[PDB]
Symmetry: D2
């Protein structure tokens, strides 16, 4: 299932536990950006997905502050878990930095990450 | 300044506690108990003090004890304090789909939250 | 209709002509970023919208190169025109910069612009 | 390097001409290529990109109306072209449908497409 250790296409490490109540908890270690070591993540997933072959919807957030760095920013990943021989979590993400109002127009980056249980 | 009740532009209500460890926890009501859902997320607990906003994000999975849309929304944005405080966000809403329908699985939009209705 | 001079919430100026064949042409002047004076835009719109009260879908692109500056980037706006007492074009946009592969993960900003024929 | 036929990961095809002035013009279609699947495309690209190894920024729009059908929607692709023997156009896209105001919150889909010169 969702619980386990996942890697995105750039080598970031996503260590997640999916709880009975729909909770996602764990740590994220980024391979890019103003980041170093692990950061806390929390999120939610559908704990009773459809039974028609559909994926399992989920999302989570990392605020890029830990005991060693603070980038004044946060990423959310929104996506779905797809089971099978090679399980996969396909996501799109938004990375918002704290800005002044005049700079808010350039506050948010967008991209897509795919996660598997093997290193890229 | 984040902890409390917030209201978006379309009649939703966003109730949150910002914990000392960077946690966001609370409930989201998209319109009674049938419409309330758990939310969890994170925020920058040590933001800059130069006029910049406070970065944050949270997730709602659209399942409760009454309904299940097989979908989840993430909001990514920043809190801005002051007399007219706001949380300005962009969001992604992914539905569980088959592989053939995955290309149309994700909606995008934006929400602005205020402390007054 | 769509043809006219529009302004977004930051004061950018969008001068557009909607042709009978579905073509959008005109110029864009940005209130923000590495930009000066007018830039070419081209795009498309639905020349036969639904008759059920729905808006009119459209989109356009600006490459941020003109005779004065070149930011090595391009924005696309995707949205719909909504007729009314206060006509409005509501959009969401993607701004992609030319980058190296190592920097591609942070190549794309995302936002939302609303345009009116009155400058806010 | 942009002018020619490109294929995405899901069976769509587009033929584009990159003009000297920065114009993109052409047609977007399905793998089958039947007339009912073909739509006009129009966009812009950076006609003087950097020389430091960066990609070439571009974007284009397709409104999903042709002589045969009308989905009352339009997609914009925003991305960069990367040349070489394994040339690519890497994009993210937004697909907005015309909606009433009550339904505008769910008017816009987002995704990503990768285009290659080979099927």
């Amino acid at each position: 299932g969702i619980t386990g250790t996942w890697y995105n296409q750039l080598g970031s490490t996503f260590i997640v536990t999916a709880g009975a109540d729909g909770a996602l908890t764990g740590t994220y270690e980024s391979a890019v950006g103003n980041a170093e070591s692990r950061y806390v993540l929390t999120g939610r997933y559908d704990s009773a997905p459809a039974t028609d072959g559909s994926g399992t919807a989920l999302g989570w957030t990392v605020a890029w502050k830990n005991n060693y760095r603070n980038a004044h920013s946060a990423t959310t990943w929104s996506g779905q878990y797809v089971g099978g021989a090679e399980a996969r979590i396909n996501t799109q993400w938004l990375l918002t930095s704290g800005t002044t109002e005049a700079n808010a127009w350039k506050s948010t980056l967008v991209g897509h990450d795919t996660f598997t249980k093997v290193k890229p």
